[PDB]
Design a protein around this nucleic acid. Sequence first.
RNA 1: CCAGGA
Lengths: 114, 133, 65, 84, 772, 43, 196, 98, 49, 168, 263
Amino acid sequence: MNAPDRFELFLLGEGESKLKIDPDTKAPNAVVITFEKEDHTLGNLIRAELLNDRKVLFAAYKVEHPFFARFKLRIQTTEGYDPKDALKNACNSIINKLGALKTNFETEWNLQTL
Amino acid sequence: SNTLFDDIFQVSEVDPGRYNKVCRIEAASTTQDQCKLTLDINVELFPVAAQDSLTVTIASSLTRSWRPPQAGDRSLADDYDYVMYGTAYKFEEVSKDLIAVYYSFGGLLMRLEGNYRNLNNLKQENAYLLIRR
Amino acid sequence: MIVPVRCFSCGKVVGDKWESYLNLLQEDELDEGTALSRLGLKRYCCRRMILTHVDLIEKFLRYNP
Amino acid sequence: KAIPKDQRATTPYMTKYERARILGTRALQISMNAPVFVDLEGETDPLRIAMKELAEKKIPLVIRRYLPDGSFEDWSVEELIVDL
Amino acid sequence: RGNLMGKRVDFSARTVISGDPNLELDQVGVPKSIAKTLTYPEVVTPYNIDRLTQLVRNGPNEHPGAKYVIRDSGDRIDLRYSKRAGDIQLQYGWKVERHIMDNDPVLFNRQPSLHKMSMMAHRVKVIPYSTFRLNLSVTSPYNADFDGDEMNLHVPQSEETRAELSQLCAVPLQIVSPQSNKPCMGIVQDTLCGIRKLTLRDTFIELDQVLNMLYWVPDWDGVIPTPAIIKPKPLWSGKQILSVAIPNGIHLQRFDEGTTLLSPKDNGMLIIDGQIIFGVVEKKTVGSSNGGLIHVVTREKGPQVCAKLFGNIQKVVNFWLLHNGFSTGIGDTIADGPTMREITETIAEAKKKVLDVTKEAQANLLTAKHGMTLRESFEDNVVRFLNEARDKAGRLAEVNLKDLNNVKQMVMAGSKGSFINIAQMSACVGQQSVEGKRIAFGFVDRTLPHFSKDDYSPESKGFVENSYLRGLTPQEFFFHAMGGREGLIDTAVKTAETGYIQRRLVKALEDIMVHYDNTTRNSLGNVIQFIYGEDGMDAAHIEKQSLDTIGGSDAAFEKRYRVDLLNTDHTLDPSLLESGSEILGDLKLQVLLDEEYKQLVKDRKFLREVFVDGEANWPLPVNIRRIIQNAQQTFHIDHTKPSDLTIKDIVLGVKDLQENLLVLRGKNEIIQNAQRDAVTLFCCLLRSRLATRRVLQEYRLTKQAFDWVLSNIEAQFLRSVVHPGEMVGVLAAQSIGEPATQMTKKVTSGVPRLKEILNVAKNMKTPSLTVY
Amino acid sequence: TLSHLRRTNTPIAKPRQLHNTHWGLVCPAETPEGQACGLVKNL
Amino acid sequence: ASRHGQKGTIGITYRREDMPFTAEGIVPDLIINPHAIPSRMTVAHLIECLLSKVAALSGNEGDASPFTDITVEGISKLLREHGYQSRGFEVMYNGHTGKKLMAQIFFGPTYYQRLRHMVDDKIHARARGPMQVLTRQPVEGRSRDGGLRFGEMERDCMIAHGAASFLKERLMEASDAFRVHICGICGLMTVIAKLN
Amino acid sequence: TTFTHCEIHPSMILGVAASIIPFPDHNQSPRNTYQSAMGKQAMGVFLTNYNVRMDTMANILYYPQKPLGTTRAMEYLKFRELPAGQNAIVAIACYSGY
Amino acid sequence: FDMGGYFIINGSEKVLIAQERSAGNIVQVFKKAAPSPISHVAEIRSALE
Amino acid sequence: YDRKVPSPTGEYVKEPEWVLETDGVNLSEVMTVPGIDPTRIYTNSFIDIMEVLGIEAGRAALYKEVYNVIASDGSYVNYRHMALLVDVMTTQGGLTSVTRHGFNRSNTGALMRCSFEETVEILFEAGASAELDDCRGVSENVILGQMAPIGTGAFDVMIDEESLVKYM
Amino acid sequence: EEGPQVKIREASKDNVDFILSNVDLAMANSLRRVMIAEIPTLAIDSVEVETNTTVLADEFIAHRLGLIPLQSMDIEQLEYSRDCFCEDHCDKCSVVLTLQAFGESESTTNVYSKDLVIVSNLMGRNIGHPIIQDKEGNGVLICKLRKGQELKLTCVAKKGIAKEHAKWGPAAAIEFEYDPWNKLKHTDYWYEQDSAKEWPQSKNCEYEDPPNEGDPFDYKAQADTFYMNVESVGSIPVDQVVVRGIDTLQKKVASILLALTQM
RNA sequence: CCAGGA
Ligand SMILES: [Mg+2]
Ligand SMILES: [Zn+2]
Ligand SMILES: [Zn+2]
Ligand SMILES: [Zn+2]
């Protein structure tokens, strides 16, 4: 009865962008991206990759409440570097890493006879 | 901006009473007889056994937020093996010209007993602890 | 009542395995633990599904209309 | 009988209850389209308006403080200390 | 009683409650359906007109919508059916009956309601799912759990009513309660359990997690604290990252058994400027404790700040524990192979000790204690040995369980369980009682038909030798069942007896309140108390403080308080203050230090007359200890350089501050003498803590530091007085009623005694004289 | 259903307590909490 | 509830990915708090579990009968024979990160019961509704769309708070409230108000 | 040496409800008293003829399961034939604090 | 599996609940409390089968 | 019993004493016994304390007793609460009980009194003896649907046209 | 080859045992999550009941029909009805299944997932075939009928993910382990006497070097090398649970890059 | 009334 529809977890709302980038007030060159209809699956993945970027000073994500599929990701970079670009690169790195993972699995699978 | 204390001590005892990753170390200065030291150390990170000679340094520097890498090109003010950052919490007047200063490195406690460093140690959040050997 | 399709905990289809289990017991005389394991039910979540089932449907069928 | 201003002896400070009631009353009046005695610096909630009026002591209300005998001391909101 | 003192009411709602680590202390999760039913009548005004028109357009089915429109004309428009529900054009002064919305103040209540805290004002938070969600730390005041409890919600309908809720009964305001002059909400369960775990010396956090833990704090400055360990590998401690939730200015000191400034066992507590220096955070620190981190925060920073701290401490702790994990298993009840041999042999020797007293009693050699049967005397001994045993056996296991024991871990943090629980589970359940005595002979000369007659053995009269882990014998099982049933009977009965006691207290006190003359009167204006609680102070504003002057040796007092500018040894050293050199031998000044000391001696005798035992710790307004602490960090007090204070600055400064500690205001001897009286005790404390020697030698205060301390004592003291209007009657009734509800030489005590007391019972049960 | 056909009512010295004589005849655990506690016996 | 007086309501429902998991791929159906167990001393709950874990693997009926020679040690030995750690613990991995939990979770099957008390048959809200005939006050019970009782003890709390106007509202506007015409001479409700 | 009688089985001192409690000899006295009250409110198949009877309210469990941990006394109580619950995979853990 | 033991009255099942009474025709001696003229009483609740 | 007493040197020191414990009460008589401290003698029966030592001592004993019941359960209630109860039972000049007999039989208004235990009888007497309700009690205002003289309603609020015209 | 590497240990129709080296734990997990939750599958979603004389409820049966695995090989060429342009369903977005069963036999008549028949046009794509892993070739036992017991119904199967319903979950349990010797100190082993004796050694211990006590703690050490086992239900083949999982997560990340692009 | 829930 007070139960929300199951698609609300993944299907974007009426006039609701996937990303909402707001700037952090408390810190210089820091931003806050709210990811709608997303969970840990993506949050922790991105956060961990931004951690690999040397020019990235701060990176963390939080699912403020479990009833809602959305998470806030805070990115802080060195002066001159843009956090949107930092996010862009980490996103790219992830894809390229997954691309190799698929290629490598495919090759290895084809070798099996079962 | 500069060093505040330097001496080489020799560890008398190492104590992990129920603590698996931390130890209270008891040392005395090889130079000054008056000087003694009590200190909690992450022994899982930098192991310590008794009779080890250790260079123990203070220094107020080398404020605002903390930055992780770039330290490759940056001047690592550590010619030392294990470094801590903590706060001075008490100034004990242990008779005569003798003084004792208490340092908390986020719970990891330290007590340095001596005399001379009147013109050095201060009640500051800023105090690093450097250890080599 | 009536074998669950899919184990609640992991969702391995368990719907097919019922008659086969009941058969490995009457026809093969086999003990419950071996029959389950024969049927490839390795995780205890899957094991509990068959091992602890009560097929009440069979009583329900005993009434005429 | 009404105690003279020069003979008032109740607290020079506003009671929790007084302040809660002034804020309640002003907010109610503000909400019933009463004239607002302050610059609403974009404000729209009548309680936040009330808070603002009391913050600048521009509330034209008086507390009639009754004594157990029946007498009373009248105190202006402008004159009451708001340490709460 | 049923239609007038109580009423069935509109704008009410009720459902199953459930907890939430993600709600703020003062909010309440309201199911969408409940929000869509409950309504607030809002007047159409230039400020809201557009918004209101939109909710009207939204209608009764959409969430932020409305149900009715009330025209000036008086007739109600039903938006559900009106053909004009679309083209509805609002007019200033009309009322829109709109849905309950996020941040509306609402009365939340858990029945019974034997407390003012059983009904508190919360912020709405419309949420999905059919349950009322509440912050876990607010559980205790309501006395709620989530085993199937339901709670009541009432919606105010006026701007006035709303103000009443938000301004008087909102959850943050209710944190420090007058019931026991301490916090009535603290950190519980997961957060309490996780808080110990986080704050051990052993506990270190890697960068990755530190960043998430930091971001999780909603008011975090954006400043990454310098790691306690910088190379090899940057590492932060629990203590460190918890301190981010602790606000600046917060000063706390606590010494537990064996605490040194080196806290070897990570004992007690030391928080300086809202940063933990040492000790593990648990029940004593972060619970609903008198000295509490919460008590200090509410008092020092505000109720709104403290309420934020609850959420903060939980958001960090819960997050950390989510990733650390915590469990509890049978392995946690299991005790060592040799510890079990040692336990068995503890019961074994106690079993003989009992047989020995039995053989002694059967041989008529036993000699009864004056005022007791030979038998009564025997049973006392048996019962005493068997308990001594259960405890020994228990204390054996408790010691043998490592710090890794999940049960020990919960007991250690204070989150759940006590010593006895370990004892009964791991080692031995113990002796079973009914009506105080061991299991009696229900059958002729025996407890069960499986026993021989005249069997006074532990096994026959209900001693459960075994642990719960081991299991109970049928005999042990039935005796435990008898003993168990006894508690269920009183739980059942007490419930209504306790209820009626509450009613009578309330009905006798209801009409009592503090008037604008500081007098406590009833509906007849008859004076009950001349001044509220003999001190004219509000109970919330009071804290246990130590009156130094009271105890110690006459010599120790002297060293602490005496200043003698006419003696080379007992003067204030010129290191203490600048005037030190010029102060020696000042006869005129010495007259002032003589007054000072003479008053301090006067005070000592007086306090020794009040508190006959010499008890120093008493609940008084204004925590002077804390003001000094703050002056010290506020003014960065240099414990080296000499003060810019005069003896006149101190001596007279204090004398003057005292005249400004106003409780009663009238200009007349009666009221003025009355004022002096009310303020007496507080001043003895004030004079003890602010004597010249103390201020200079101990506190090392500068003139500005002192000037500030004085102003703050004044301000705090004034804030501390009761507010005319305070319904101290009901307060007092509920403050005795609520505790009576939690109630389980041998004299009639507890619930049945309270019953005797309130009834002014003529024929009492245990009359007794205490002849000194 | 079973436990309802084995229920005992006791209307109006210390009746609520589990007596020794209740051994093997009445269940030491199956009794209500509150008002009827120990006055509703189960065989 | 379990068969050990260990009752409770659902606080949240998590999907399989959010849930903590064994390396073996097993996930709980239910997560119950450690804080239940100590104060309660429901040891048989823990034993039920251990025995049920063995039972599930062994495919033999786990005898949980009262007075027997079955020991927690006996069952422990049997579980070690199955490859699991004897005291029922299992290392779990966090569902959100995949990182091992610093703690090992007591995990295994336990017989849980579904009770007659469900939230949707309980939930109730009212804001103006049917009134009694006699007293002209809100009708009783969820069933009848009744209003809740702001009773005597609730009046007391309001009196304690000093919420004078909040109380007046509850008792008047929010319920009962009516208007009569009384006489100034004999203070009676005698007045024939032909107000029109 | 005087023994006139022997107990058939000591577990028989228990009633219908308490006889479904696994290891009641390992629980604190009232926790048992609680279960023999709750099981009366536990859902399951009450009778196999449910589909042929018109009763006000009937609650039937979709997939009932016999318990993995059982009592020898349940044999007579028809419990394994007509159960009141399901064997759930239960973790005793601190998780999201929910 | 139905076990019988109830009646069917107007279509609803009904269970007679056993009622517990003091057995009759039974001699019992009781001490009559501190404020009483009578110190002890022998009672017999005599009734026909 | 162990007693804390100041030593010659000043510090409070444990100086235990022999104390007698009775199984019954006779205040008047045991007080006049040679060898006791008639200044220290205490009874749990405060009804006796009242009768022998006056109403003031009656209050002190009554509090002592109330305090014990709470502290025995290991609970803390701030003084003032217990003090108030103790005072209310006292003020009349004797031991006025928290019962239908005690408090409920005082001079408070009929409507307030009828709200507890004797309702109809309280109102019949109210009529018969032409009682006048002051309407000062919380209870009456609740029965009247009026704002009670409680906190928020313990004072009145007025607009001042002077101050009103001043701000514009 | 390049970045993260795979080394398959065992294969079948139902299981994939492998080793994932040169990867972030976060990545290993995110893939694990996706496989469970975000891979699309076809499953019965609407059940119109014409006749039911069974001992079971209309919805009881209906529920089961969703849990019956259907061929989701070519699931990628089917549209989500939500995204499709019709009115309810069509061929471009659904598979229509039919089930007519009757107790002709004096003996108990069984109803199986094999008794399901496709009535919609498949557009020649591998979809909607009830997955039969059963030795005797019956598949899932839906129902039991006696004599005049008839069951006549219609099923509409739709594309979906496990987030909406666990019926669209193509994977059974996913096994996941790393560091079988606790070299990383990621767990503090609960014990009574010895954690080594008390806790069972992992299978994967053989695929890693034991720590050798006479060595200091490697703090610098990080988590790479993950021993996993992916189990399929039928809808998609074991390999494709891994591949499609890798691909879904890749697509999921691309959406973010694209979102930034539109911004 | 009867049965139950915190
Ligand atoms: Mg509860
Ligand atoms: Zn499974
Ligand atoms: Zn008239
Ligand atoms: Zn379509």
